[PDB]
Amino acid sequence: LRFDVPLYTLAEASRYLVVPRATLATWADQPIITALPHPTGSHARLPFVGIAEAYVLNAFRRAGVPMQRIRPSLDWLIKNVGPHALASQDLCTDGAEVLWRFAERSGEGSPDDLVVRGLIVPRSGQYVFKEIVEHYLQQISFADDNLASMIRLPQYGDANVVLDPRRGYGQPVFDGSGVRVADVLGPLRAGATFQAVADDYGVTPDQLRDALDA
Amino acid sequence: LRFDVPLYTLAEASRYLVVPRATLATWADGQPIITALPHPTGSHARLPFVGIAEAYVLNAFRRAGVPMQRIRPSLDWLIKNVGPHALASQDLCTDGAEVLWRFAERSGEGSPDDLVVRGLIVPRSGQYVFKEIVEHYLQQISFADDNLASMIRLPQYGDANVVLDPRRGYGQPVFDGSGVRVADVLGPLRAGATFQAVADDYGVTPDQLRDALD
């Protein structure tokens, strides 16, 4: 379900990932995320692997990584970790060392070195990803093929809201009940109590407050 | 510290309240429905603390699906009955639903006033009360001697318990528990400090830091 079908418009992905739509447009149009031409009468663009790549790149952006000249680092990562490396199970464990190797040969302070310095730091005599990056990488779950199959959106907190192409058409769902976050909003807006909605939708009141306030 | 000096630009308030900047501009510039002041020379500051409190409450109304374009008469009514700056009043959450109900009764079924008030209140156990989706936000506000808002907890930060408090961090988001600006933990994390090191340095927990980041 993750590669061939565009599941997300850029508008939707901007909301779910908390990244400016214009930024995503730049990434999708050479492109640094997987995007497909929009279907007839639809603005869908990103297959699930593409939103996973966008999610990781946003984590890089949040960390202060310069983004405009990141493509050679991404090419290098793909050449060493494999296709769709940003969405790979091996990124978090192998990526820091791979990137270090790239920046070494790049020249001190070169654009590649600046990308890589944004991502990694020495820890106990070796380079590792900064925890501010790791925190986001840790949210991703992987399929048989070691590529992303689910992403937990930490902005929803203990609601444990995920993007999962197997549920809710890939739109944000409570992992615990498979309900679209969107489907609890109408009832709350209508004036149902948090307890009534939580019971009706298989979550807790605290989880609902967390979803609302994400 | 809450009335006579503008603390917030509309840009800042838009971020802290999670409301479009253009929406705040309409509320501040109009007649205005929030307290705003002419910007100081060389500054874009507009909202004193009471004004951001009123904006916070109006945003809770907006979130609930309340029609906002013709809300001013309901606000006038509320001020006339609950008192000056009623949106920022300690008495809003306890007295406001009944006050608004009385207003909409005389307004005509489905009139603009009735539609505002139906957006806010529901029957509970034989009386009209605020919908819980509104109450959730009203409950975040703390009050001074004068029964007007003195602090607002921003629930989007979750268990970090981040607040707007004009007594600390110039009114910018601070961790209630240490009085540190959320802004001041970001540089150290981006630089590659661990969540543990930052949390210890800034008097919060690693879990609270993750909540703030997200």
Helix-strand-coil split of chain B, %, nearest 5: 50, 15, 35
Among B190, B210, B211, the residue to mutate for chain A (most A Cβ within 10 A): B190
Residue B89's DSSP bridge partners are: B148
Alpha helix (H) ranges present in chain B? 10-17, 21-29, 49-63, 72-82, 92-107, 112-120, 132-138, 183-190, 195-202, 206-213
Give B158's contacts in chain A (Cβ within 8 Å): 157-158, 210, 213
Give B190's contacts in chain A (Cβ within 8 Å): 63-64, 130, 132
Query: Going by C-beta distance under 8 Å and a sequence separation of 6 or more, which residues neighbour residue B41?
Result: none
Using the beta-carbon criterion (under 8 Å), do B158 and A191 form an inter-chain contact? Answer: no
Query: Going by C-beta distance under 8 Å and a sequence separation of 6 or more, which residues neighbour residue A24?
Result: A10, A13, A14, A17, A33, A54
Q: How far is CA A142 from CA A86, B128, B156, in A?
A: 12, 49, 28
Q: Looking at residue A147, what DSSP letter applies?
A: B
Distance CA A153, CA A132 (A): 15
Q: Which residue has the tokens 């961090």?
A: B169
Among A67, A132, A207, the residue to mutate for chain B (most B Cβ within 10 A): A132
Instruction: For residue B36, count CB atoms less than 10 angstroms from its CB and return exposed for 0-12, middle for 13-18, buried for 19 or more.
Output: buried
Q: Which residue has the tokens 């997987």?
A: A34
Phi, psi of A22 (to 5 degrees): -65, -35
Residue A117: CA count within 13 A, CB half-sphere: 11
For helices A48-62 and A21-28, the axis angle rounded to 10 degrees is 120
Tell me how close the Cα of B185 comes to any Cα of chain A, in angstroms: 11
Distance CA B214, CA B212 (A): 5
Q: What is the dihedral of CA A197, A203, A205, A210, to 10 degrees?
A: -110
Give B156's contacts in chain A (Cβ within 8 Å): 213-214
Nearest to B104 by CA among B113, B96, B112: B113
CA B58 and chain centroid, separation: 7
Q: What is the dihedral of CA A74, B195, A52, A18, to 10 degrees?
A: -110
What is the distance between the terminal CA atoms of chain B, rounded to a whole angstrom? 30
Radius of gyration from C-alpha coordinates of chain A:
18
Q: How many CB atoms lie within 10 A of CB B75?
A: 19
Of the candidates A64, A155, A213, the beta carbon closest to that of B190 is on A64
Q: What is the DSSP string of A63-79?
A: TT---TT-HHHHHHHHH
Per the structure block, which two tokens stand in for B181? 């600006």
The SS3 call for residue A150 is: strand
Number of H helices, E strands in chain B: 10, 8
Query: Going by C-beta distance under 8 Å and a sequence separation of 6 or more, which residues neighbour residue B1?
Result: B49, B166, B167
Per the structure block, which two tokens stand in for A102? 């790239």
Give B68's contacts in chain A (Cβ within 8 Å): none
Q: How many CB atoms lie within 10 A of CB B196?
A: 12
Interface A-B, measured as beta-carbon pairs within 8 A, has a size of 58
Query: Going by C-beta distance under 8 Å and a sequence separation of 6 or more, which residues neighbour residue B8?
Result: B16, B45, B46, B47, B51, B52, B171
Q: Domains along chain A?
A: 8-152 (1.10.1660), 155-212 (1.10.10)
Query: What beta strand segments (E) does chain A contain?
Result: 8-9, 44-46, 120-123, 126-129, 140-142, 148-152, 161-163, 173-174
Per the structure block, which two tokens stand in for A162? 């995920």
Please name the residue of chain A whose CA is at the shortest distance from the CA of residue B18. A213
User: Are B8 and B50 within 8 A, CB to CB?
Assistant: no
- Mark out chain B residues that contact chain A at CB-CB < 8 A: 63-65, 121-122, 131-133, 136, 155-156, 158-159, 189-195, 210-211, 213-214
